[PDB]
Design a binder for this molecule. Structure first.
Ligand SMILES: Nc1ncnc2c1ncn2[C@@H]1O[C@H](COP(=O)(O)OP(=O)(O)O)[C@@H](O)[C@H]1O
Ligand code: ALF
Ligand SMILES: [Ca+2]
Ligand SMILES: [Ca+2]
Ligand SMILES: [Ca+2]
Ligand SMILES: [Mg+2]
Lengths: 128, 995
């Protein structure tokens, strides 16, 4: 969809910390994902058409495509859960983020029911 | 090759198709085939029925699309159209129903430009909002040549503002019948022509409520009082008085049908009337011309009907019957003055009655009147000089009467103090006739100044703003008219100053003045001698009998006869004394050497310019549709030049990349900051603004950040107005709305980024899976089947192959049978053609194995093989799994082979050398590229060279491995099956990959 690409583009800037338009490892590790260095050079090698190794946004999306998505969203929630109870706390969301008051304002604005924490059934609503 | 606009002599533009193109010109075939230059040909709107309210909405912005858009709208009685915040108004020449109603007035209040259809009311409302919000006075300038609709639109504006923001408030409106009675007259161009310029100020208090107003008047036409053309009239009052006055008033003032008065009877003596209003006028009021030819026709003017409305207006604004009667008494006095003839000088016997009536109505002694018109002071006057005395008295009396009327009008709506004003400018419209005099010169000069102000404000300063702010808006050039203004008002050398000099020297001369003008501007772009005129109807005018000024609105030829006399405002002492000492109090109060009319005018107009420069300015550009005062007659060519001369074509051009709305970034941000939670406040100001513009509609192309001001594109006035709105709740609601949006972003950003990592990680597993699967297909021994069809110089052959591959050892064991008889080529030339997926890639090389990674779906191998000094092969091979066996289908074409060469003459030895093959990635095609030379041994001990060019691309769209540059080592052994009866080859090959 035309919306989903724009959402990915905003996410792409969290990969493009330098702001130039070009790292994957740095954020992939920091997002708390084990997979080492060997596989990254191999994965980039499918979209880099000019050989430059320059990472461009149109490359990013195609590089992500496969020939199951519902479980990916559920796995994304598990990236927020440090322990894995079913709720995300202010201290949990602060971990993925790296002011504390701003994190509280961020937590409260998602909490639809009123528990002071964010569960999956409401984590999806925010995303779409 | 879509239809286009190209010039038309009377429509301005016509539709046609380009047929042939030259360097600077082309041919157009109308929808008769004709020549047009490239730069007078324009792209057309694809829908010829559609119209847009703002010309900036057009797909193509040019003078032709502009003309057509206005044409279509006028066809539907949509007389108003925008170019950004400027209004174009085409004179309908009929009353469009309800379009100016009080109900319509209310509907425009507080509404942003664009949210209602283009209207004079929206411009007036825009001026009000600007005044109220920016705390800055405002001026509405309504331009246009004669009869274009300036006075009518001026009235619509004044009516809007006073009805909308009044609460005695209708006096500014009710005043016009009075001013028009004394300042308006019939012309060939306009039945209700204004013969004076006016600036009507509506003053406001702190609460932005109307507290009163002020009318400034400029240069009333003086000569019209005494004489006019056969098709023109004196001021309406005379005819309104004669048509409508009671029999009582007629007797007291000794009035009769207009033909009886020298000051009326050289002009048109007919009344404006219809069937119904003709009956309401008595017979003793109607001239022989009226009786012979009927009334004059107009939808707005009606002499008898206007008299009543005037009397009603006077009563409505505070004028008592005493003052009404005083006014009428002076009017008739001036009339009777003109009926005084002279003979040799002395008053003629017949004009005795005229002297009595005039002296009585003007409160004068007969003997005193007779002497003042007849003698100079202390010596007697010639017949023609007495005429000059008579007419000069009439011109001063009527002029002072007019001054008194506007002054009396200003006293209806006075104000102690005001905060701001909205002023509406209504000058006399650009005009020209068969004979042009000082009247046209002064009027057209004033028109030049207005156009210069439009140029100054809309074309010069706008682009200076874009540049000072670094916007990079394409410059629009245009011809400026300041030179034309310089020619007229410059110190010492200007026409007005040269004219004043002429009045000053001992024996003044029109021709000495005219000569001086020409001599002092020898080669000037704006001045020429009458001999260079386009028309031949004015070619016999000598150099010192006139000049041409090339006005912005067109060249006008002036006859300079009577310029000197007309430039002098002064009245001689004996005439001045006579009238100042009238026994009539009213006439004494009318009056409270050389006085320059030109320089008094220039001073007044520059003081007006000072006013205008200090205000925010809005423009309404009025257009005359035709020359015959008819409705529904759009004359394209005539309207086109008005659009060009007005500068609207230049403006439309600028708006292709221009920005009509702008605000100070610092000011805009700070007014929202006051409501920002202290968190959002930390956010980069520019980012907040971007989020705010998003929240109120705008896309990124709709606005631009300059160095200090943020600019907004055409057609976005409502959005702009919402952004700028100062209301606390509105600023709080918006801040809340963007605050929410930023939290929704920050969430979605880290949310989608988490999904991004999940997908990246998933893709990695998806690559490995696929490559493992490919690799696990080749763990053990794998059966092969090969099929080739070949054509070599017309020799068609087929071969079938079978055997097995062992990728662990890199071993190929294959037997090929030619099923079609003898092979037309030597077997060795087919060895490289006769499943690289069976190559040995050792431990640390497995990452470089494209061939296995494409499996089971496989790949296409394409080769060109060049046999040096001989022909070439082209091969296409399709290699993939088919169950547990690897299959390969090949097509081969050979051409250009020498029939007695090594290939077709079978001179190659049945053996094979070892070779290295250099593999590299073909990044663009997602496969590999290969280059190698095979050396084949010739019987006599020489070598046949075979140059190979190879490309492999995968069949499926699944993931494959793209390798680092590496090479494959081949060993090949050729042998024969001792029991095989058919033509054949047994091939044994070993292949290892290496660094
Ligand atoms: N909006 C309008 N509706 C109806 N009639 C109009 C309109 N504008 C102009 N006219 C007609 O055109 C004539 C000339 O317009 P006017 O405003 O007097 O010209 P100028 O621009 O010289 O002041 C008017 O007498 C009136 O009949
Ligand atoms: F006749 Al006008 F302005 F009133 F041109
Ligand atoms: Ca690249
Ligand atoms: Ca948790
Ligand atoms: Ca919750
Ligand atoms: Mg007018």
């Amino acid at each position: 969809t035309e919306e989903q690409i724009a959402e990915f583009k905003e996410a792409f800037s969290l990969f493009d910390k330098d702001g130039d338009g070009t790292e994957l490892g740095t954020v992939m590790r920091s997002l708390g994902q084990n997979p080492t260095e060997a596989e990254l050079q191999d994965m980039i090698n499918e979209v880099d058409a000019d050989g430059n190794g320059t990472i461009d946004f149109p490359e990013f999306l195609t590089m992500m495509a496969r020939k199951d998505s519902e479980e990916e969203i559920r796995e994304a929630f598990r990236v927020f859960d440090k322990d894995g109870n079913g709720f995300i706390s202010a201290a949990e969301l602060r971990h993925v983020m790296t002011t504390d008051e701003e994190v509280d304002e961020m937590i409260r604005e998602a909490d639809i029911d009123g528990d002071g924490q964010v569960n999956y059934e409401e984590f999806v609503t925010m995303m779409t | 090759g879509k239809p286009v606009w190209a010039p038309h002599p009377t429509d301005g533009f016509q539709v046609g198709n380009i047929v042939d193109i030259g360097p600077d010109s082309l041919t157009i075939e109308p929808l008769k085939t004709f020549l047009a230059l490239i730069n007078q040909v324009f792209p057309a709107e694809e829908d010829s029925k559609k119209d847009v309210e703002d010309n900036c909405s057009l797909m193509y912005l040019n003078e032709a699309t502009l003309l057509h858009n206005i044409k279509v709208r006028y066809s539907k009685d949509r007389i108003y159209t925008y170019v950004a915040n400027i209004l174009i108004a085409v004179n309908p020449y009929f009353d469009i129903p309800k379009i100016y109603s009080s109900e319509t007035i209310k509907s425009y209040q507080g509404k942003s430009l664009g949210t209602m259809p283009p209207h004079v009311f929206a411009i007036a409302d825009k001026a009000f909002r600007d005044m109220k919000v920016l705390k800055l006075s405002q001026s509405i300038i309504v331009s246009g040549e004669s009869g274009a609709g300036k006075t009518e639109n001026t009235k619509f504006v004044l009516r809007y503002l006073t009805e909308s923001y009044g609460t005695i408030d209708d006096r500014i409106v009710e005043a016009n019948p009075l001013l028009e009675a004394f300042g308006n007259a019939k012309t060939v161009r306009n039945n209700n022509s204004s013969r004076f310029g006016k600036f009507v100020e509506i003053h406001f208090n702190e609460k932005s409520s109307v507290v009163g107003g002020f009318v400034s008047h400029y240069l009333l036409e003086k000569s019209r009082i005494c004489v006019q053309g056969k098709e023109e009239r004196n001021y309406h009052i005379f005819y309104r008085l004669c048509a409508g006055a009671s029999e009582d008033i007629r007797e007291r003032l000794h009035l009769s049908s207009p033909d009886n008065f020298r000051y009326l009877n050289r002009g048109c003596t007919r009344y404006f009337a219809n069937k119904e209003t003709d009956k309401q006028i008595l017979q003793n009021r109607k001239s022989p011309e009226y009786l012979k030819a009927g009334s004059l026709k107009d939808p707005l003017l009606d002499d008898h009907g206007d008299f009543i409305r005037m009397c009603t207006a006077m009563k409505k604004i505070g004028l008592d019957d005493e003052e009404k009667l005083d006014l009428f008494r002076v009017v008739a006095g001036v009339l009777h003055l003109g009926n005084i003839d002279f003979e040799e000088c002395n008053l003629k016997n017949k004009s005795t009655q005229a002297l009595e009536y005039c002296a009585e109505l003007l409160g004068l002694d007969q003997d005193d009147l007779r002497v003042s018109l007849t003698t100079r002071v202390k010596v007697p006057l010639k017949v023609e000089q007495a005429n000059n005395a008579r007419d000069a008295l009439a011109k001063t009396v009527y002029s002072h009467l007019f001054d008194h009327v506007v002054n009396r009008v200003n006293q209806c709506f006075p104000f102690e103090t005001s905060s701001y004003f909205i002023g509406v400018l209504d000058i006399a419209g650009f005009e020209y006739f068969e004979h042009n005099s000082f009247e046209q010169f002064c009027i057209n000069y004033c028109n030049e100044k207005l156009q210069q102000f439009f140029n100054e404000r809309i074309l010069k300063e706008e682009q200076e703003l874009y540049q000072k702010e670094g916007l990079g808006v394409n410059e629009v050039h245009y011809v400026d008219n300041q030179d034309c203004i310089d020619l007229i008002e410059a110190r010492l050398v200007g026409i007005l100053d040269i004219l004043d000099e002429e009045n000053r020297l001992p024996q003044p001369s029109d021709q000495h003045f005219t000569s001086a003008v020409h001599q002092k501007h020898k080669d000037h772009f704006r001045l020429s001698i009458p001999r260079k005129s386009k028309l031949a109807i004015h070619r016999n005018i000598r150099d010192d009998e006139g000049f041409i000024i090339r006005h912005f609105a067109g060249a006008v030829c002036y006859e300079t006869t009577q310029f000197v006399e007309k430039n002098n405002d002064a009245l001689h002492m004996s005439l001045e004394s006579l009238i100042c000492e009238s026994r009539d109090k009213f006439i004494r109060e009318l009056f409270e050497s050389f006085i320059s009319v030109g320089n008094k005018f220039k001073t007044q107009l520059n003081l007006l310019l000072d006013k205008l420069r200090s205000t925010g300015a809005s423009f309404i550009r009025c257009i005359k549709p035709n020359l015959k005062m008819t409705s529904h007659h759009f004359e394209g060519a005539q309207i086109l030049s008005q659009l060009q001369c007005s500068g609207m074509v230049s403006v439309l051009d600028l708006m292709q990349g221009g920005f009509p709305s702008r605000a100070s970034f610092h000011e805009l941000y700070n007014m929202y900051k006051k409501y920002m939670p202290d968190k959002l406040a930390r956010l980069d100001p520019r980012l907040f603004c971007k989020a705010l513009f998003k929240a109120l509609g705008l896309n990124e192309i709709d606005y631009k950040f300059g160095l200090t001001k943020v600019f907004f594109r055409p057609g976005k006035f409502a959005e702009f107005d919402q952004i700028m709105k100062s209301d606390p709740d509105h600023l709080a609601e918006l801040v809340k709305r963007v605050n929410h949006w930023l939290i929704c972003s920050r969430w979605k950003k880290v949310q989608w980024c988490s999904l991004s990592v999940i997908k990246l990680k998933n893709k990695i597993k998806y690559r490995a899976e696929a490559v493992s699967k490919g690799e696990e297909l080749f763990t053990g021994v794998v059966p092969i089947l090969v099929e080739l069809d070949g054509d070599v110089n017309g020799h068609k052959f087929s071969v079938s192959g079978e055997g097995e591959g062992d990728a662990t050892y890199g071993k190929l064991t294959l037997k090929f049978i030619c099923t079609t008889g003898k092979l037309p080529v030597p077997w060795p030339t087919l060895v490289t053609t006769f499943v690289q997926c069976f190559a040995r890639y050792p431990d640390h090389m497995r990452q470089h194995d494209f061939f296995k990674s494409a499996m089971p779906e496989g790949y296409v191998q394409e080769r060109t093989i060049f046999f040096k000094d001989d022909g070439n092969y082209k091969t296409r091979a399709e290699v993939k799994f088919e169950g547990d066996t690897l299959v390969n289908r090949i097509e081969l074409k050979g051409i250009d082979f020498k029939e007695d060469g090594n290939i077709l003459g079978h001179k190659l030895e049945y053996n094979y050398n070892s070779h290295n093959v250099y593999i590299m990635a073909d990044k663009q095609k997602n496969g590999i590229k290969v280059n190698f030379k095979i050396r084949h041994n010739i019987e006599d001990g020489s070598v046949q060279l075979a140059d190979h060019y190879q490309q492999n691309t995968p069949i499926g769209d699944g993931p494959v491995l793209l390798p680092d540059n590496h090479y494959l080592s081949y060993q090949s052994a050729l042998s024969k099956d001792p029991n095989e009866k058919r033509d054949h080859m047994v091939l044994l090959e070993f292949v290892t990959a290496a660094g």
